[PDB]
Every structure is written in C-alpha cells, then in structure tokens.
Design a protein around this ligand. Sequence first.
Ligand code: HEM
Length: 180
Amino acid sequence: MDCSTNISPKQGLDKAKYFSGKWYVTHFLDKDPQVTDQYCSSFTPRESDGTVKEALYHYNANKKTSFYNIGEGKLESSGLQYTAKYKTVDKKKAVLKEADEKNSYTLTVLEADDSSALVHICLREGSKDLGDLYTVLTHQKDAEPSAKVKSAVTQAGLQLSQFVGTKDLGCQYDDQFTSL
Ligand code: HEM
C-alpha cells in the first residue's frame, strides 16, 4: 500500500509555527489500515540545527491502551519535511528499542499557522511502505482547526469529511509524556 507520491512541504512556512507547543490530531485520513483499530495521537516536535526530535504518543481507542515513541531525523533541503528513525519507549521515556536503520517515517508539513497544521506521514519498514496518513493538528484537544488548514485539506485534493474525527473516539492523552 504505497504512500502518496505527490507530497512536498509548503514553501514559505515559518518553522517556528510548526515546532511550537504540542499537537493533537483532530482528524486523520488513512488510505489503507492493516488494523481496523482507530487511534488518537499527540506529539511534541522540536528542531535545532536541522535536527528534529519529537515525543510521540498513540492511544488505541478500541483497546484503550497507549504506546510511546521518540522520533529523530534531519530536515530536508526542501523545507519542513523530515525522515525520522524512532525509539520505542515506556511512559517514563525509558528506551525499550533504539532507533534502527530499516524502520522510519517521513513527515511532510503541508500547512501550519498559529493554531493548527496539516501534515502527511508515510511509515516504512525496509523496502515496504506500511502506511500513509494525513493528519489535521491543533494545539489543544478538540480545538477547531483553522480556516487556513481546512483550505489546505481541500487544496491537497481531499475532503475533510472523509477523515476520521478523533473527538468521537473517546481519546485519552498523556500530557505528562508530551510536556517537554
Ligand atoms: C490519529 C493519528 C494516527 C493514527 C490513526 C495512527 C495509526 C497508527 C497505527 C495503526 C500504527 C500501527 C500500530 C501497531 O499495530 O503497531 C501506527 C504506528 C506508528 N505511527 Fe501512527 N498514527 C497516528 C499518528 C501518528 C503520528 C502523528 C506520527 C508521527 C509523528 C506517527 C508515527 C507512527 C510510528 C513511528 C509508528 C510505528 C510505531 C511502532 O512500530 O512501534 N503516527 N500508527
């Protein structure tokens, strides 16, 4: 299930707006889920000298469990786009597995403003694309995405209505994990 091809970062985006606060996923669009479980997610991206580090949380809304990761990658020469390898961690950020060289994700920022963002994530393992997602992001749980980001969704060729809205899933977040 190939990741979407025509994906490049929006040029002219202020990186200070993207590497800002934390993000909560309000809406996600999954091309082809392998599992039918639905997730909520929040993460806290930071950048220094072209290196991105981010604390990542997933909550399985069906099973009511959560898992944790730390991503690390370099910004491309193209703008706000990065391929990250990732550690697997417990809730206290103790390392369970270190980043390896065959598992990565590529995150492309399509829009970002003071309240909201739209990003695309392709997850890979070895020679295979595992999964492609678009995600609408806000800085507080269940905040409304901005008009600018809703327009970004339409301009990406998508319909926001076809995304899964996470409000309905009964998400639980770990704001301690994502603080810092
Ligand atoms: C609501 C939004 C999201 C959904 C629905 C979602 C869905 C998924 C699913 C279904 C998996 C597979 C879990 C498994 O069976 O092991 C997964 C793993 C993963 N996701 Fe997400 N995801 C979301 C947000 C994010 C974001 C924002 C990022 C990166 C910034 C991300 C990065 C990853 C990574 C690195 C893995 C691999 C974890 C592992 O192998 O341990 N995801 N996600």
